[PDB]
């Protein structure tokens, strides 16, 4: 049962999520994210810090980027 989709502006940047197993985008650029067995999530820009949800992972990415575009 994949999480629900989401779309919001977080710290001036648009973050979106949607079931594929699940895709996340930061300003239109896809961000690699992964789900852990226990349900938590991580992203390539925060791979050792599990967070509860995909949106949490997207927000963590925006935080990490400090305004920088995602490659």
Residues in the annotated binding site for Cu(2+):
32, 34, 47-48
Which residue is listed with tokens 């967070």? 51
- Per-residue interface string for the shown chain with Cu ion, residues 13-52, x marking contact by CB under 5 A: ---------------------x------------------
Report CA Rg, the chain.
Answer: 11
Residue 47 in the binding site for another protein (CB under 8 A): yes
What is the β-pairing status of strands 46-51 and 6-10? unpaired
Closest by CA to 24, choosing from 63, 62, 50, is 62
Contact residues for another protein, defined by CB under 8 A: 32, 34-38, 44-50, 64-66, 68-71
């Amino acid at each position: 049962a994949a999480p629900e989709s989401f779309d919001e502006v977080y710290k001036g940047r648009r973050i979106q999520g949607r079931p594929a197993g699940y895709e996340v985008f930061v300003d239109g650029v896809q961000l690699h994210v992964m789900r852990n067995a226990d349900g938590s999530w991580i992203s390539v820009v925060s791979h050792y810090d599990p967070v509860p949800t995909p949106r949490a992972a997207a927000r963590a990415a925006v935080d990490e980027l400090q305004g920088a575009p995602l490659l």
